[model samples]
Target chain A: RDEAGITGTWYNQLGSTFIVTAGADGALTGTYESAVGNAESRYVLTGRYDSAPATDGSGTALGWTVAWKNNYRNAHSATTWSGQYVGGAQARINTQWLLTYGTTEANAWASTLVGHDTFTKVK
Target chain B: RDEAGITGTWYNQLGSTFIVTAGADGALTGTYESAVGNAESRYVLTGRYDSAPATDGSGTALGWTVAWKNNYRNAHSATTWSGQYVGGAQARINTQWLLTYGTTEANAWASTLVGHDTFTKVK
Candidate 1:
């Protein structure tokens, strides 16, 4: 998938929004914020995309390893946000975030599947 | 300082921004995002603040323990964001963030002083 095709803002049912920007060098940068309860959460994320194409050739398939810092919790973790970019009006990208805590794999928090957070292009 | 006094948006010279929301219950939640180099970083954080008053009695003093997930680098860490809130037009907040790399203090990366990131209320 062309990186530019996935560059934009996206919203989810979880009351979170993502402002994503993709670079020509396959770099992905963005913000993800949510205020679902008494607490508000924000993530400043950066990552690079894989160059693989979707097996079905329906869109560009890529994988990403993003890093983020939680400002309020004063903690940090990394996420894998991978999906296919099937471009169209109201482009839909299905993705999941697998989160792991810590800087090293040895002492890292048990990796967990945080669940799917499919997004629709809003901008 | 009243917790409400610190709830708002802030900008820094580093091209990073913060959206902070403080609760009456002493909970502080926020998002901090930055794009300085080839990478774009996002952090989703949650924490609570101390209710002590500044030593000088000028404002409320608070210390926060925040947790974060790095969306790009696939790492996590905790940060101590402590500071005094001196209310005024800019609502200046003097703060520092000390970061550590693991979920467990025992195996955590050596704690490092990431640097001061003073914030002025913009909204």
Candidate 2:
């Protein structure tokens, strides 16, 4: 069994951003620079995903499991993710997910939500 | 301060694989499928990296810091990563890293390495 972990950074074409905080049970949260209509706010997200085939139990593989929730005062949201893997790496489609929401803002955001650029793990 | 955890999956074009297991101090390990010359094996990787601007002190920011090592019995390697952010998303170049490594295999791999497809976060 392979028991190891992989951690790195990612970004997109737009100026928005987020981060991966690796934790137990293969959980992570990403924070984005919240800028909506000239209102600069901060958003926190929390969720659990699986880093499968890990012997040590820390999620390692790029496409394992994912669950997320947006933590903004007026933003309530959640989603699930599953995707593909290739050549010892994580592929674009492999990390794709379906986002569902609760609050009106979240529902609105998801309604118009479009996909952004993909990510690649760096050394 | 916004302190939370998020976790997810990722895949790739070539079908190789790995996993992410998160731990304290923002450490992670990953395992990959090892197939070469009709031989099959497993590879384990371990390393330390930073998540940036995290309130919970967990590494956040898709473009903060990255350091990694390949831990196969016959393979030894390491690398570093840094990149950009867009619209609260991690952009392509923003997540790019320069992989510097030790050992002969590492040098060979990097020498012929061509950039693969990028990764996108699933919702």
Candidate 3:
């Protein structure tokens, strides 16, 4: 199943798209061009893959960090994601992420904010 | 505010603890001793800090990957996390993570999973 190509254009329900390329050694690296905030940059992504191809699909885990423009009380903010691959006719990439942005300083205890996304091979 | 130290022992509500050390260049590095999985591994963590130490707190972003023993059909599996520091009298680190472990083939569309944890400085 190593021949099962993970190299392609993958897109999530959101406006983000990933141009993924996998190596023979399970090194998963790519460029993430997000639609959020009309990002001017295409961020770099790093992660790994099991590469144990199955009749279905092999498991994939990947993530990236984005330096977003500050918003409110948060400063030097960033966004991150962690995800894996799903197998089927409609192969999907399931993921979870966190987005941080702000200026000034946050004074109270804050809760962890997480967002979810599902990606599929497409334009 | 860059003088405020982020180096020391930090613990979440969970059994895990982080021994974090920050550098003059905003490099955040450390060792993680986890109580989960009861495994024999001290994982390494990597992240960055703004160094704009606020009377409240500075924003921190960090993460790490854990290679766990396999169960069932899942052959090559791993867990990952993304988090930040929360400011207050009781400084805290808020985080969200994904834990993936399984066996055989996942035949249907699975929802992305996300876990939450809040870490605080301590022994």
In TM-score terms, which candidate is top? 3
DockQ (C-alpha based) per candidate is 0.02, 0.03, 0.23
- Model 2 lDDT per residue over B6-46, tens place: 12233334343434454443344554442322223444433
lDDT of each: 0.49, 0.30, 0.55
Better of 1 and 2 by lDDT: 1
lDDT of 3 by residue, A1-123 (tens): 332656778888876788777666445556677666536556545444555534443455444444332222223545556566765667776667766532234432352456777788863
Candidate 2 per-residue C-alpha lDDT over A1-123 given as tens digits, one digit per residue, 9 for 90 to 100: 121222334443344344556554444455544233222354443332333332321222222111122222322222222221222454221233332222232233232121223344441
> Where does model 2 exceed 4 Å of error?
A1-6, A34-41, A54-73, A76-81, A84-94, A101-117, A121-123, B1-123
Alpha-carbon runs more than 4 Å astray in model 1: A1-123, B35-41, B50-57, B65-73, B102-111
Q: Give per-model TM-scores.
A: 0.41, 0.30, 0.63
Instruction: For model 2, state the Cα shift of residue A88 in Å.
Output: 6.3
Error of 2 at B23 (Å): 23
Worst 10 residues of 3 chain A by lDDT: A66-75
Clashes of 1: 46
Compute the lDDT for candidate 3.
Answer: 0.55
Ranked by lDDT, top first: 3, 1, 2
